[PDB]
Design an enzyme around this catalytic site. Sequence first.
Site, short mmCIF file in Angstrom:
data_model
loop_
_atom_site.label_atom_id
_atom_site.label_comp_id
_atom_site.label_asym_id
_atom_site.label_seq_id
_atom_site.Cartn_x
_atom_site.Cartn_y
_atom_site.Cartn_z
N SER D 204 1.05 82.51 39.08
CA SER D 204 2.21 81.65 39.00
C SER D 204 3.29 82.63 38.66
O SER D 204 3.34 83.13 37.54
N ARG D 205 4.15 82.92 39.65
CA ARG D 205 5.12 84.00 39.63
C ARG D 205 6.10 83.83 38.51
O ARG D 205 6.33 84.76 37.74
N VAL D 206 6.61 82.59 38.34
CA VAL D 206 7.54 82.23 37.29
C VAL D 206 6.81 82.33 35.98
O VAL D 206 7.33 82.89 35.02
#
Lengths: 120, 253, 83, 339, 265, 236, 116, 48
Positions: D204-206
């Site tokens: 989950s990049r964020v």
Amino acid sequence: KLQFALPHETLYSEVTQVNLPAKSGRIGVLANHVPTVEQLLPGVVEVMEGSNSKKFFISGGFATVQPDSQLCVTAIEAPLESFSENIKNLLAEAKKNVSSSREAAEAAIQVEVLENLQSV
Amino acid sequence: GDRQTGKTAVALDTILNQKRWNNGSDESKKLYCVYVAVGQKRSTVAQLVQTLEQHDAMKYSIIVAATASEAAPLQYLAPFTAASIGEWFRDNGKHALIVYDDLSKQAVAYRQLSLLLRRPPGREAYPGDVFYLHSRLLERAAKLSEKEGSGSLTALPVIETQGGDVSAYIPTNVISITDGQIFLEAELFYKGIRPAINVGLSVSRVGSAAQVKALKQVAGSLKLFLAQYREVAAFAQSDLDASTKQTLVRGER
Amino acid sequence: PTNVISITDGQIFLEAELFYKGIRPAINVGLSVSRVGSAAQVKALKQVAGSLKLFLAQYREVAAFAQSDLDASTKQTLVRGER
Amino acid sequence: GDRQTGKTAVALDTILNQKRWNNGSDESKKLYCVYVAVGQKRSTVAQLVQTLEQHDAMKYSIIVAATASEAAPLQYLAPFTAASIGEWFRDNGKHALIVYDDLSKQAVAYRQLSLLLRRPPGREAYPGDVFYLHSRLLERAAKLSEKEGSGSLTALPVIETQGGDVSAYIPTNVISITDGQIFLEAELFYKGIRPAINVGLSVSRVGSAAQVKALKQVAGSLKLFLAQYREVAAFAQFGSDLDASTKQTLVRGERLTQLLKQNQYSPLATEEQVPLIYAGVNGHLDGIELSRIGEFESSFLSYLKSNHNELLTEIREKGELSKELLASLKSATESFVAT
Amino acid sequence: ATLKEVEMRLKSIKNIEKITKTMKIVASTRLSKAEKAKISAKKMDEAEQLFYKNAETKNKELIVAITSDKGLCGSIHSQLAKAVRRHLNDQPNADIVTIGDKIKMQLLRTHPNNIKLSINGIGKDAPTFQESALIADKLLSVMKAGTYPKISIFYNDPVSSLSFEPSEKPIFNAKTIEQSPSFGKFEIDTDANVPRDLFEYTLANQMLTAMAQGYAAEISARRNAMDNASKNAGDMINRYSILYNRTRQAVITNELVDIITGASS
Amino acid sequence: AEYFRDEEGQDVLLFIDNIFRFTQAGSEVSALLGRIPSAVGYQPTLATDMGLLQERITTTKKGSVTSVQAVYVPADDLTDPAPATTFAHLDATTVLSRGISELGIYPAVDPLDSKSRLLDAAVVGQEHYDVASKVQETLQTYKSLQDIIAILGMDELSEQDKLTVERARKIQRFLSQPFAVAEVFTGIPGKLVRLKDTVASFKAVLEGKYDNIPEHAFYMVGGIEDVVAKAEKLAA
Amino acid sequence: AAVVGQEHYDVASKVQETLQTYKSLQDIIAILGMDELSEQDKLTVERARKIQRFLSQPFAVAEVFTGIPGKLVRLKDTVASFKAVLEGKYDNIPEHAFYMVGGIEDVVAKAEKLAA
Amino acid sequence: ISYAAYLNVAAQAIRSTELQTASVLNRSQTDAFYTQYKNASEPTPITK
């Protein structure tokens, strides 16, 4: 002969005369000897191959003359000269150990080994 | 050899040694080298030019340049064009060395042309007559007959292997056509052995037929020793037989 | 190959490995089946041959895992199977 | 991850735990959830609505459907018209969530439609511009600034990978667009994580900046322990006697994995996820035997529900763990060493 | 897909190949020390055997067994177990002293009732007099060593540095000394405590030799096993390579179908 | 950038993101143009389009422009033709390993795959060159030693090797240094450290001079002063 | 678990887990011998080999083809049959016993048959 | 104490001038433990 042996090294396992410290007092073997077993005590040992004589400090073991003039010697570890100061350090430890006391055997042996080394 | 793994450097080294003969007055042994820079950016070729100028090699070198920016028709004809320059030298009876770097990018350009000309793709999506193309280029090089004059056009094509994919169609075709291959190994390069030649995967099919007699004598042994060294690289964590240790020592040195 | 196999009732796969390694008929019985021919036989060749197909696909399994501790049941099967 | 294999189930779980926030007032906590079902049979849909009614979440669910029978144009049109419905909420300043299950069949619909439209080209037989279609769709979900809007549409695309072929054009395209990937692995499903998320490939990049502040604190080295567990475990199944420290990792790791596992159709309160991760990270569960981990989880929660329910209320209410709360929680776990 | 499932399994096989390679090499290093010990020990032991032979060797018993704690010995653990198992039909009630964990597991299955003494720290170390002596001291007290008419020791004789034959021998007790009469062709005084001392001393001397022989065989088998593993892994590597190559060609052919679609354009 | 390079006659430092998107975009309009897409569907003119971009970005006597072009490698396979074509076209490749990121090392750079054509005694000086060779070897040894450590254990390993592993671990976490953009993450501002300082500090570690400094006291910290300070911090 | 019951679901779970592990250790099984597999695992693997054999049931249409009379096993019987086997109650009997048989009772009886 | 324990203790004492090899020191220094058993059930493992 002589077939002096240790697990970690074999020292002779011919050797004309061997002088051994035994529960049977002192035993000397020269050529053939009468066929016996003798327990080697913690010892000061002389081994002679020819006239040349080698001086040993020995942790005891067993000696057993075979009737074919083969002196089977087994002992745990040996030179006397290599062993010959730390033994004095050990004496302090051994005395201390005797203060408390298997520990009795330990302290007794440490003193015994020191006395026996001290003898030469 | 492996992708951008100083492929050009290995090649460039040869050219510098050709300076020795070039300096020399033996005109047949003046090999007028031709570097064929295919899809190599103008900056890269500029660096090449500067390096060559530094090593005073520009004065027998010819650089046919079809840079990355330069169009695919020019790129397609670029090795063919280069060959014609060489033919003039060869025809004059002289010798020269043409280094095609790299035919892998030639393949891509031909592909671009072929697909746009609606000519079918073929194995590994390269056009089908890429084999014919490579074979035409690679047979031009040659040492002529005595009656036709003692001249030659030595050549040294440079082929880029994607990850050492010798299976790949463009390598397989080319490998067959050329008499010999040299296969550099990336691990060795990284391990600082430059040249990074994988001795096993380097063979020359004409090889020692042209070799100095002196150098032949003192390097037969070298082949055999190194052969053993490859096999005898197989211990790390012992104590080895004296023969094995000798081999290992000879090989390492 | 699959298109034919699916149409045909029974297949008689043959193995090169058995052929090379002597064994002619070289007819692998793992991949030979007959799903209509087993009720086309005379009763004698049904009676004598009962469950031998299982047995030699027990021999096949047995020698698969033969490659130490092999019970007399497995050993018996192996001894019979090989023979 | 691989088709149907809890593919529906992962999404339903999200909807179900969001019942707790949804029941509560304040429209930003309310997710007006939109479940988009493309290519699924009427019976599947009927089961879905039945499940939603069973858990009585239909009280806030919208089901936008495009059944298998329904036309290829209507299927193609279905995500983009779902998006507008979501935007009405989003525009209103309301928060919502759109599940796009499965976009892979939408692409097929656009493939069939485009080829019938004589659209000439196609990587894997999908014409270029499918990426344009999908990208514009995905970029129509957003958290909107207080000045302009207040809603947040959240999107969850669902792509069913054909034998895990992630190099397939449609999976590749989506991966670039999306802000997370949630790889699910079938082998691990069978291994007993049901659902099974292969966290090694899931990202989950964020990431943490939307994770609960308490939960961020507790799960800090949970990731490290697990990551180490993966490496250690891989060598470890060569069955050599590893360093005791290495086997500490292995033992700790094994227990953590088992802790993560949860059963389908059961959502879980965050207030009761904070303890489990605290306990695990504070290694109390590392000792507790693998078999009776499930017993521990159930019982521990029951025990806190009985006794340290004051503590649970504080974690829920204040959503942060004081030094004192961390200590209280530690003490509670120790007290329940019964298992 | 296919491509990845081939590759991940092939990676497992590769990683195993590397580990078995690593192990085999380290095993060779260990093997030299293990082997070295057995020569000196065996030489020492024979001198005592000279007495026992000439004396005549004439005889619930004890079973002692030797393995390392460590595994990947080979089939040392279970071949030794098998040679024990035959004589565990001949003494199903025998009290087993297990020198090493690996033999412990196999025997523990065969009769847990039999398991009375076990010794840890064995496998880690290369056999040493200190250990043998301490084990001897414990053997008398714990196992009541004197009760058995003769003790029996099982170990692995390292026949060749590629082979092992599991082997056993009987350790001669004071009872053996008592009823052997050509002890008189080695006469010593009643005053000497030589039977009870010689029994103890050769209890250990025989045991140490057995341990050294076992340790060398264990490490030798481990090397052999890890070599054969590397070979087996290579064969599987090749099988998956052929599959990989065919799969690669088939994907290219499916891509050629895409080329045929371009031909339709 | 050309306006800067040319008309403002200045150096620049271009940044583009992500160039796989540039590749993808061209492929799609190749198809829409009906032009038969080449290998793995990528446009026929991929090489030449990339080439124009790269050629435009260069040091001329008007300016100097330093592009940093991000590239996304689908499913981390670099022999995929779109990455592979880009692989040739660039001068200073960097691979960011997912594994190293996961190990918590931020920079997430894979130091065995970090390659720049310039790195020589002629470039960064002999000391820098030699040091960097030593670092590479030290790390490579550590990676190799992972297999021995794996089965036998870290403890069961040669003394020379063990100091090399421990030092490599110190170097490994030396790399981990905070970022300004990981105030969002860790909350620890970035740390700008001079070339000379890095060479000096790394040399010390290899010599074992900083073997009185914990491995974790190199972790996620910058400068030498900090490395020393964090040893004290952990100590206290 | 709310359809065919938690007990059924649990039973099935264990079968799935056992088989997936067994499949996982297929690599290890070939490269390194059965003995060299960890003891805990060696039991599991052996159990799984038995389970694998257990899954065969002679059919009543293929009763002709197998040559074994077809056995149809009740659902109520099935849950019980696997449950016992999973607890290793009857595990101590040949892999052959588990091969091509119906219910648990049949396995037991075939052990007696094999024993003869 | 037992004769071979007695002799062992002496060998250990004898390696203490200290001018003795690594093999000697290993031969007279072991930290090995011993797990007593009975029945199956194990009376605790303790230093040998």
